[PDB]
Amino acid sequence: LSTAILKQKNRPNRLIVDEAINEDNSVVSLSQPKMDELQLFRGDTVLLKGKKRREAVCIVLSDDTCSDEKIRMNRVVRNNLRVRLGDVISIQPCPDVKYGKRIHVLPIDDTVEGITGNLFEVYLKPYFLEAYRPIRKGDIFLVRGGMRAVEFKVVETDPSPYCIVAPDTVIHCEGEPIKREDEEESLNEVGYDDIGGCRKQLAQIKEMVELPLRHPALFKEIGVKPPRGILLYGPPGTGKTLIARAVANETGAFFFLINGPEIMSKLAGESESNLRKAFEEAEKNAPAIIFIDELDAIAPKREKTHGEVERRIVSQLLTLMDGLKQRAHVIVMAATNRPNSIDPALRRFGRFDREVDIGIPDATGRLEILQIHTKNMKLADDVDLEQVANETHGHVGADLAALCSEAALQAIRKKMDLIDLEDETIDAEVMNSLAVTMDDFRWALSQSNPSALRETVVEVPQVTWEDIGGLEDVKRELQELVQYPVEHPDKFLKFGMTPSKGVLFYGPPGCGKTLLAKAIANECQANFISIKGPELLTMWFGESEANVREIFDKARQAAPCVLFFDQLDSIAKARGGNIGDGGGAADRVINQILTEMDGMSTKKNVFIIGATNRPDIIDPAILRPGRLDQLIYIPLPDEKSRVAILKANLRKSPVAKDVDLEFLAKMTNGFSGADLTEICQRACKLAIRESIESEIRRERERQPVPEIRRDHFEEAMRFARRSVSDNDIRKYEMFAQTLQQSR
Amino acid sequence: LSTAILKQKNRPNRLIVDEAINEDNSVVSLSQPKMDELQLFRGDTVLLKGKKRREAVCIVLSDDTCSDEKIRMNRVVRNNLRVRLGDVISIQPCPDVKYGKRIHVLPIDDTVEGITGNLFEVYLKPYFLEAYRPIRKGDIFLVRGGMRAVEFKVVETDPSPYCIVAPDTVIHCEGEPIKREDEEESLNEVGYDDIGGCRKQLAQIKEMVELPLRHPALFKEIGVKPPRGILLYGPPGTGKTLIARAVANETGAFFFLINGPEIMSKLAGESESNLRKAFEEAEKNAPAIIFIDELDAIAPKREKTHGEVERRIVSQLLTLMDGLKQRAHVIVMAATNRPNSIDPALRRFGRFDREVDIGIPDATGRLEILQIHTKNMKLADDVDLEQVANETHGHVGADLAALCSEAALQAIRKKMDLIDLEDETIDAEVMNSLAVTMDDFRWALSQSNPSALRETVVEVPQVTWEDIGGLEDVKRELQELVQYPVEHPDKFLKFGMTPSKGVLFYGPPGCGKTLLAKAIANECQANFISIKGPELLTMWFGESEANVREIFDKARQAAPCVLFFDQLDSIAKARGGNIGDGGGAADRVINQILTEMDGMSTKKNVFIIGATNRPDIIDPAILRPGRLDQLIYIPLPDEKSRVAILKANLRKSPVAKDVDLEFLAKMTNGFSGADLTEIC
Ligand SMILES: Nc1ncnc2c1ncn2[C@@H]1O[C@H](COP(=O)(O)OP(=O)(O)OP(=O)(O)O)[C@@H](O)[C@H]1O
Ligand SMILES: Nc1ncnc2c1ncn2[C@@H]1O[C@H](COP(=O)(O)OP(=O)(O)OP(=O)(O)O)[C@@H](O)[C@H]1O
Ligand SMILES: Nc1ncnc2c1ncn2[C@@H]1O[C@H](COP(=O)(O)OP(=O)(O)OP(=O)(O)O)[C@@H](O)[C@H]1O
Ligand SMILES: Nc1ncnc2c1ncn2[C@@H]1O[C@H](COP(=O)(O)OP(=O)(O)OP(=O)(O)O)[C@@H](O)[C@H]1O
Ligand SMILES: [Mg+2]
Ligand SMILES: [Mg+2]
Ligand SMILES: [Mg+2]
Ligand SMILES: [Mg+2]
């Protein structure tokens, strides 16, 4: 119930926005029982409160067809109130609305292009002649007249912001034409409703910022001071500065914006004075909100700062934050991608004391974000955004916006066959037939990738489970560990049993350890991170473990995720394996991997997979419970599995019907999966050699091979060798025997 | 569908540029049926649109010999329209072209060298007398008369930009003469047609940079904002800066350049101030393009950056791209060859959201690059660019340009002994005779090596397959090893199986393991990286693995490449044999080689070949198929080989007829090939 502040509550003034029947730009209608409930009289002026602090004046009337909870209200004041159909607005009477003296209204530039008539007599005089229409400073109204309808913007009113347009009120239209860009930017201004997937964080921010500034007495009587510093921290793209934009657009208090690097100045000491002057500018316009974007830019650790001016700036900020209690009416926010780099003194109680964590949205959060970004988008009927939000597993809101933009560009590509770039104009019918479909979202989802992982992505060959032969039980387990919590989250969480956070693959080389990982990457609907072992190591001190920390943190945001540590022999070898280990850089890397895997334990599933080649050198601390709990032995295929391996490799290759894949398996008593592949590649190469010789033979006399035959496999069989010998197999069993005895 | 934007849809306005017959500078010729198709009347003034947003005005005159798909025009308008014979331009009516009031023309300096008379009366007044010539600002036209034909530049007109030179129109030529260098630079300006091998990338960049600018209504209708950030990445020489230059040249929007290190300044807060001033200037002149060249110079990782000024620069860039005050129709482009070094915050959407990879071109793309680079050059008829493109395997566009320059330099060299360095002038006959032959491409190609490989280059003693005696079967496996996947990639795909890309040579010393590698380096048509074993290893903790990674990454960039390990038992030994071996780095290097050879990445045409004296210490993982899958045993020569080895050594050696090499093979039984050479 921490979101009770978000709940819009029941107010009699609340009404639903609906299409108008006869309502013009200055009159609205309410139902007669609602008029009697609100004590609203016909002919009274009423005020409508919408989103983004947008307000308008209209006359209230009675309509017997109007629902009680609903209002009849036309589109001009819809755009004025910045609301759409279905929205909830507030209505109250406004007394003491006097006759207007002078108003300055100016047309919209694109609504008057090519128009040279007398604007007053054609447009303003007939519309306001003896109508007594109520207006507001900044109102937009559409007037019919001349050869094309014209919209105007009110620029000045006398008095302001409310007055009555009387027949003797001075109305003039001279002035510079208002550009469309300003009106469009004001219309597309961001509000709270733009924000999705962070309702809890939105409630926290509102009750930390808006409620104290709006009602300081409500806190005063109970005797608790408002929170003076709020820190918004999270991974890039989550919507921190979007929250800042929403607050700045829909708060009552004056808003001051500070960008960290902007504080810097060349003159000696002027940067601290700039921070100071910003704070006193907040002082004069109290109450106020200060937003310090990129706080880590100007607030590093003073223990680690090598510059005098930066250290002075941090200390000056600390002094200002300490005095912020003396201010009593100023609230400061800060957004940072790395909260850990900020000096801890700025995180002490009384300085950024309450920290809000803007996190990765869930499935319903991603659905909300997608719906928000598709509100201006035009969609067909086949589109279902719930599936799209389901398929985006680790995507942050910025990634979802990128997905929507890519899908729109894909629809534009689909229409690019008809549209011509070099054309001076675009046809109307082609423009109208343009629309976004499910196929565009599916293409975008194909090309979609979280921005956090673009540095860990690798191009993996196309591998599907049918490509892998044998290991049928192993395949089921891998789907039973990965696919069930991904597809059935409710089952696992309800039971409450602790999961295995690892599956170590130990087996002879070429038996499918890496292919199973490729199958996970291509099929399983979870973000995949492939870590080649010795990538994380760095010769420079401290960074080698840092790369381990960031990678483990990197998979943390994108849960569901699979962290594939290929060849654990390098990063995680036995403690004391380097008996000297004077530097300890390898040892500290092994310890760091231990810290992270034990460090995180929560509902969101992050699977760590290691495809070790020879598992005995691995530190057993990795294999001990709590880390890599489940182990799968990837064995050499038997006679039945080998036939599947031969079929899976040869399924895309045209082969003779005479070739018996069952016969080849029993001859290959001990061959691995890779060895069976070499038999097929060797046979394929021999067929190519014949085809090259055949085509040379035919062209030589003038101046082939449709499929691999039985003789081709016969010639390729003699070159075949058994890669992994019997002695190598025993050690792989020996590791299992030692673990089984301990188990 | 990806390159749908690059389709040049056929419209009647699209016409082929053709030579002139009797036309002067101010007219072009169209076929009568095509005129009736577009309702064009003879004598009408029309507006011509060409490359690089270049416009010209010409009069339409009918010709029965003019093709319906072609338009006749002279050299002057073609140089005005920045097009060539065989290009496509758009022709449309240009009404309301008024009579000129007063125009300013300035002659070209090199056409007036030695002319001291009144340029007006000598050239211009006869040129425009009762002609009503249509002219446009910036046009270049040549006038005959006097002592030498003189070109003129129209720098200003009244009205603008189109007017007709009427008899009363004032034509004055006073002013500062125009430099030749400026005209040359403008004529050799770089456009979208100068970039080859990047059709997908050009499609993406045109969709991002050109399409929203030219049609800012499609996105308004569909209700989205097109991506406003492009990050071009790839190995050096692929053309990222070239694509930036083409975009700057061919766009109408204001274009601002930001070189990386130019931002840095002495005084505190001047780097942030410079970035802010650039972005504010772009915002004022919206729509605009900002190009940040060498972005990794000023945008490194904040967590990996020591100096606080650099982190402040990164934060300022982050706030400028996306902050509380969003950008106003500004597109930001950047080019780096290390996209991973860029800070992770810059890569998300609302920033460098679209990352476009300028990869190494394949055969057809590099043929396109060669055609682009040879359009200005003059070549003999015997040349074949297709063969030159086929032979250049790992070359990048810069390397192809270097090949062209080297070939032209060889063409100059061939004509050197005729001409003199200290002579005042070159013989005109030598200049006319001068041309680039196929021999010059062949020589430049022989000396041509990729830029990526200018470090891993060694001198090889030029061994041929005939130098190696015996090993007849092994040679056939080696020749078809590298030839088949590159010469016939279709055959593998038709049979649908991956080629084998690994060979291990093991045998007694002196039997030709290193010799076979020498022959591969010369005879085989693929890049060759030869590295001895221990050279990769380094004192530092992570360097020894990073060295292995960059060699394999370098071989991938140069595919098809052969990566030969001279003593593979050095760098690839059995793990666990020595506990505490060094810092454990030797075992980790084996792991690095293991993942690079066969891992989760897609495998290119990189053939890994290794030779080892003692293969028993080789790590069994390295021997697994998919890594050195073929284990070739090169044993001591039999009697038949011992004859061949003796003959191969002495093939260039004058020997007596009486000595019988056949007997020598029978006496030696366990002799190695090195031992046989010792006798010789
Ligand atoms: N929860 C959300 N709901 C709706 N839109 C969102 C949400 N989160 C992000 N976006 C959108 O995705 C983009 C995120 O950019 P923005 O700069 O606001 O994110 P940020 O995480 O605060 O940034 P940074 O980490 O760089 O400070 C914007 O286009 C924003 O509108
Ligand atoms: N079950 C299988 N079905 C089909 N192909 C297989 C199978 N097992 C192995 N292969 C083949 O072997 C190769 C896969 O080797 P992989 O990298 O998975 O081996 P590994 O057991 O992880 O060994 P290592 O990492 O020690 O070399 C591919 O060429 C693949 O075609
Ligand atoms: N695709 C291409 N088409 C035509 N010419 C090309 C192409 N790529 C490179 N070139 C040629 O190579 C040079 C372009 O170098 P450029 O500065 O664009 O490379 P780059 O990839 O940006 O390099 P770096 O990353 O080192 O800055 C020019 O001489 C140009 O003619
Ligand atoms: N088959 C051969 N034909 C001709 N010369 C040969 C042959 N085998 C060896 N030689 C001669 O042996 C000498 C060096 O041989 P090479 O370097 O190829 O041996 P290797 O087997 O690779 O040795 P190592 O593994 O010990 O480095 C050269 O003089 C070369 O001419
Ligand atoms: Mg932000
Ligand atoms: Mg593997
Ligand atoms: Mg460059
Ligand atoms: Mg050797």
Interacting residues of B320 by C-beta distance below 8 A, sequence separation 6+:
B275, B276, B279, B327
Check the CA dihedral A602-A603-A604-A605 and report its sign: positive
Instruction: Report d(CA B327, CA B286) in Å as an integer.
Output: 10
- Residue B398 near ligand 3, beta carbon < 6 Å: yes
- What is the token pair recorded at A346? 């700025």
The Cα-based distances of A32 to A49, B230, B271 in angstroms read 21, 58, 66
DSSP B453-476: ---S--------TTTS-S-HHHHH
Instruction: Report d(CA A381, CA A208) in Å as an integer.
Output: 41
Instruction: Report d(CA A12, CA B620) in Å as an integer.
Output: 80
- What is the token pair recorded at A684? 């394929």
DSSP E strand boundaries for A236-376: 254-259, 288-293, 330-336, 354-357
- Show which of residues 66-125 on chain B sit within 8 Å of chain A, judged by CB atoms: 90
Instruction: Report d(CA A58, CA B188) in Å as an integer.
Output: 65
Question: Which among A451, A586, A629, A567 has a CA at the least distance from the CA of B352?
Answer: A451
Question: Which among A240, A256, A228 has a CA at the least distance from the CA of A352?
Answer: A228
Question: Which of residues A599, A633, A667 is at a domain's end?
Answer: A633
Domains in chain A: how many in total?
A: 6
Question: Which among B452, B467, B591 has a CA at the least distance from the CA of B521?
Answer: B467
B206, B224, B349 member nearest A398 (Cβ): B349
Instruction: Report d(CA A413, CA B222) in Å as an integer.
Output: 12
For residue A161, whether the previous peptide bond is cis, meaning omega lies within 30 degrees of 0, is yes
Instruction: Report d(CA A497, CA A493) in Å as an integer.
Output: 8
**CB-CB contact of B151 with B144 (8 Å):** no
> Any bridge partners for residue A18, and if so which?
A72
Instruction: Report d(CA A353, CA B274) in Å as an integer.
Output: 35
Residue matched to tokens 């000045």? A156
Check the CA dihedral B192-B197-B203-B208 and report its sign: negative
Ligand 6 centroid – CA A672 distance (Å): 14
Nearest CA to ligand 1 atom 25: A236
Instruction: Report d(CA A695, CA A700) in Å as an integer.
Output: 8
Compute CA A526 distance to the chain's CA centroid, rounded to the nearest angstrom. 16
Burial label, A303 (beta-carbon count in 10 A; 0-12, 13-18, 19+): exposed
Instruction: Report d(CA A70, CA A261) in Å as an integer.
Output: 50
B368-372 contacts, C-beta under 8 A, 24 or more apart: B368/B196, B368/B197, B369/B196, B369/B197, B369/B397, B369/B400, B369/B401, B370/B400, B370/B403, B370/B404, B371/B196, B372/B193, B372/B194, B372/B195, B372/B196
**A480 with A528, same domain?**
yes
Backbone torsions φ then ψ of B57, nearest 5 degrees: -115, 130
Compute CA B288 distance to the chain's CA centroid, rounded to the nearest angstrom. 27
- Show which of residues 152-181 on chain A sit within 8 Å of chain B, judged by CB atoms: 181
The shares of helix, strand and coil residues in chain B, as percent rounded to the nearest 5, are 40, 20, 45
Q: Which ligand is nearest to the CA of B613?
A: 4
**B167 with B227, same domain?**
no
Instruction: Report d(CA A27, CA A46) in Å as an integer.
Output: 9
Compute CA B141 distance to the chain's CA centroid, rounded to the nearest angstrom. 34
Instruction: Report d(CA A737, CA A401) in Å as an integer.
Output: 53
Backbone torsions φ then ψ of A173, nearest 5 degrees: -125, 5
Task: Establish if A614 touches chain B: CB-CB under 8 angstroms.
Answer: yes
- Show which of residues 36-65 on chain A sit within 8 Å of chain B, judged by CB atoms: none
- Residue B339 near ligand 3, beta carbon < 6 Å: no
**B170 lies in which domain range?**
98-188
- Residue B415 near ligand 2, beta carbon < 6 Å: no
**B305 with B320, same domain?**
yes
- What is the CB-side half-sphere exposure of residue A364 using CA atoms within 13 A? 2
Instruction: Report d(CA B293, CA A147) in Å as an integer.
Output: 51
**CB-CB contact of B401 with B237 (8 Å):** no
Return the residue of A nearest to B8 by Cα: A420
> Any bridge partners for residue B208, and if so which?
none
**A170 with A216, same domain?**
no
- What is the token pair recorded at B315? 């934060």
Q: Which residues approach ligand 4 with their CB closer than 6 A?
A: B 468-471, 509-515, 611, 613, 645, 648, 673-674, 677
Instruction: Report d(CA A708, CA A654) in Å as an integer.
Output: 7
Residue matched to tokens 């050696």? B653
Q: Which ligand is nearest to the CA of B465?
A: 4
How close B591 gets to chain A, by Cα (Å)? 6
**CB-CB contact of B461 with B468 (8 Å):** no
Does residue A734 belong to any structural domain of this protein? no
Helix extents (H) in A125-239: 125-128, 180-187, 199-205, 211-214, 216-222
Ligand 7 centroid – CA B359 distance (Å): 14
Q: Is B105 helix (H, G, I), strand (E, B) or coil?
A: strand
**A599 with A706, same domain?**
no
Instruction: Report d(CA A189, CA B416) in Å as an integer.
Output: 71
Question: Which of residues A617, A633, A649 is at a domain's end?
Answer: A633
Contact B498 A681 (CB under 8 A): yes
Residues in chain B: 680
Ligand 2 centroid – CA A724 distance (Å): 13
**B584 with B469, same domain?**
yes
**B327 with B399, same domain?**
no
Instruction: Report d(CA B403, CA B450) in Å as an integer.
Output: 10
The Cα-based distances of B326 to A185, A223, B228, B280, B350 in angstroms read 10, 40, 12, 12, 9
> Any bridge partners for residue A89, and if so which?
A15
Interacting residues of A442 by C-beta distance below 8 A, sequence separation 6+:
none
Q: Give the position, in ligand 2's atom list, of the atom nearest the Cα of A513.
A: 22
A297, A566, A677 member nearest B315 (Cβ): A297
Ligand 6 centroid – CA B603 distance (Å): 13
- What is the token pair recorded at A281? 């500018």
Residue matched to tokens 């406004």? A94
Compute CA B312 distance to the chain's CA centroid, rounded to the nearest angstrom. 35
Burial label, A671 (beta-carbon count in 10 A; 0-12, 13-18, 19+): buried
**B389 with B472, same domain?**
no
How close A17 gets to chain B, by Cα (Å)? 23
Residue matched to tokens 């800066």? B241
Interacting residues of B190 by C-beta distance below 8 A, sequence separation 6+:
B242, B245, B246, B249
Nearest CA to ligand 2 atom 27: A509
Q: Mind spelling out the 3-state secondary structure of B106-127?
A: EEEHHHCCCCCCCHHHHHHHHH
Instruction: Report d(CA B331, CA B286) in Å as an integer.
Output: 9
**CB-CB contact of A172 with A104 (8 Å):** yes
Instruction: Report d(CA B133, CA B59) in Å as an integer.
Output: 9
Question: Which among B334, B232, B353 has a CA at the least distance from the CA of B275?
Answer: B334
The vertex-B95 CA angle with B92 and B99, nearest 5°, equals 130
Can you state the angle between helices B438-447 and B397-414, rounded to 10 degrees? 120
Contact B319 A461 (CB under 8 A): no
CATH for B276:
3.40.50.300
How close A163 gets to chain B, by Cα (Å)? 33
Instruction: Report d(CA A93, CA A59) in Å as an integer.
Output: 10
CATH for A119:
3.10.330.10
**A579 with A696, same domain?**
no
**CB-CB contact of A4 with A39 (8 Å):** no
The vertex-A107 CA angle with A104 and A111, nearest 5°, equals 170
Backbone torsions φ then ψ of A25, nearest 5 degrees: -75, -10
Contact B623 A422 (CB under 8 A): no
**CB-CB contact of B394 with B453 (8 Å):** yes
The Cα-based distances of A204 to A2, A592, B65, B241, B594 in angstroms read 8, 34, 80, 47, 51
Nearest CA to ligand 2 atom 12: A674
Strands A288-293, A330-336: pairing is parallel
**CB-CB contact of A604 with A648 (8 Å):** no
Interacting residues of B465 by C-beta distance below 8 A, sequence separation 6+:
B475, B479, B519, B523
Instruction: Report d(CA A434, CA B143) in Å as an integer.
Output: 52
Compute CA B48 distance to the chain's CA centroid, rounded to the nearest angstrom. 31
Does residue A242 belong to any structural domain of this protein? yes
Interacting residues of A299 by C-beta distance below 8 A, sequence separation 6+:
A260, A314, A317, A342, A343, A346
Q: Which ligand is nearest to the CA of A243?
A: 1
B118: left (phi over 0), alpha (psi -120 to 50) or beta: beta
Can you state the angle between helices A673-702 and B472-487, rounded to 10 degrees? 80
Q: Give the position, in ligand 4's atom list, of the atom nearest the Cα of B518.
A: 18
Instruction: Report d(CA B445, CA A139) in Å as an integer.
Output: 73
Contact A261 B588 (CB under 8 A): no
A396, A577, A725 member nearest B584 (Cβ): A577
CATH for B414:
1.10.8.60
Order of strands, edge to edge, in the sheet holding A229-233? A254-259, A288-293, A330-336, A229-233, A354-357
> Any bridge partners for residue B355, and if so which?
B231
**B165 with B250, same domain?**
no
Order of strands, edge to edge, in the sheet holding B170-172? B140-143, B150-156, B102-107, B170-172
How close B477 gets to chain A, by Cα (Å)? 10
Check the CA dihedral A485-A488-A489-A490 and report its sign: negative
Task: Establish if A328 touches chain B: CB-CB under 8 angstroms.
Answer: no
Contact B2 A413 (CB under 8 A): yes
The resolution in Å comes to 3.6
- What is the token pair recorded at A586? 């390898």
Question: Which of residues A156, A188, A220 is at a domain's end?
Answer: A188
Question: Which among A354, A107, A95 has a CA at the least distance from the CA of A228?
Answer: A354
Whole-angstrom Cα Rg for chain A: 35
> Any bridge partners for residue B88, and if so which?
B16
Q: Is B434 helix (H, G, I), strand (E, B) or coil?
A: coil
How many CB atoms lie under 10 A from the CB of residue B420? 11
Q: Mind spelling out the 3-state secondary structure of B228-263?
A: CEEEEECCCCCCHHHHHHHHHHHCCCEEEEEECHHH
**A287 with A233, same domain?**
yes
**CB-CB contact of A59 with A134 (8 Å):** yes
Helix or strand holding residue A18 (H, E) = strand A15-18
Ligand 8 centroid – CA B566 distance (Å): 6
Whole-angstrom Cα Rg for chain B: 33
**B262 with B309, same domain?**
yes
- Which amino acid is residue B616, in one-letter code? D
Instruction: Report d(CA A214, CA B440) in Å as an integer.
Output: 82
The Cα-based distances of B98 to A40, A148, B49 in angstroms read 66, 31, 20
Instruction: Report d(CA A488, CA A493) in Å as an integer.
Output: 9
Order of strands, edge to edge, in the sheet holding B98-99? B98-99, B162-165, B133-136
Residues of B in contact with A693 (CB under 8 A): none
Instruction: Report d(CA A100, CA A170) in Å as an integer.
Output: 8
**CB-CB contact of A173 with A112 (8 Å):** no
Contact B222 A544 (CB under 8 A): no
> Any bridge partners for residue B178, and if so which?
B108
Q: Mind spelling out the 3-state secondary structure of B559-571?
A: CCEEEEECCHHHH
For residue A33, whether the previous peptide bond is cis, meaning omega lies within 30 degrees of 0, is no
- Show which of residues 193-232 on chain B sit within 8 Å of chain A, judged by CB atoms: 206-207, 210-211, 214-215, 217-219, 221-227
- Residue A463 near ligand 2, beta carbon < 6 Å: no
- What is the token pair recorded at A374? 């598709």
DSSP E strand boundaries for B260-374: 288-293, 330-336, 354-357
Residues of A in contact with B308 (CB under 8 A): 300, 305-307, 310
Does residue A740 belong to any structural domain of this protein? no
How many CB atoms lie under 10 A from the CB of residue B498? 16
Strands A254-259, A162-164: pairing is unpaired
Q: Which ligand is nearest to the CA of A257?
A: 5
- What is the token pair recorded at A612? 């070790």
Instruction: Report d(CA A314, CA A297) in Å as an integer.
Output: 10
Residues in chain A: 743
- What is the token pair recorded at B54? 């270049």
Torsion of CA A190, A192, A196, A201, to 10 degrees: 130
**CB-CB contact of A207 with A311 (8 Å):** no
Contact A293 B319 (CB under 8 A): yes
- Residue B599 near ligand 2, beta carbon < 6 Å: no
Instruction: Report d(CA A387, CA A393) in Å as an integer.
Output: 11
- What is the token pair recorded at B604? 């290119």
Helix or strand holding residue B205 (H, E) = helix B199-205
Helix or strand holding residue A506 (H, E) = strand A502-506
The Cα-based distances of A257 to A244, A290, B358 in angstroms read 9, 6, 39
Find the discontinuities in chain B where C to next N exceeds 2.5 angstroms and give the residue preceding each. 453
Residues of B in contact with A435 (CB under 8 A): 222
Interacting residues of B526 by C-beta distance below 8 A, sequence separation 6+:
B393, B482, B486, B560, B561, B562, B605, B607
Instruction: Report d(CA A144, CA A123) in Å as an integer.
Output: 7
Instruction: Report d(CA A589, CA A583) in Å as an integer.
Output: 11
**CB-CB contact of A261 with B312 (8 Å):** yes
Does residue A291 belong to any structural domain of this protein? yes
Burial label, A7 (beta-carbon count in 10 A; 0-12, 13-18, 19+): exposed
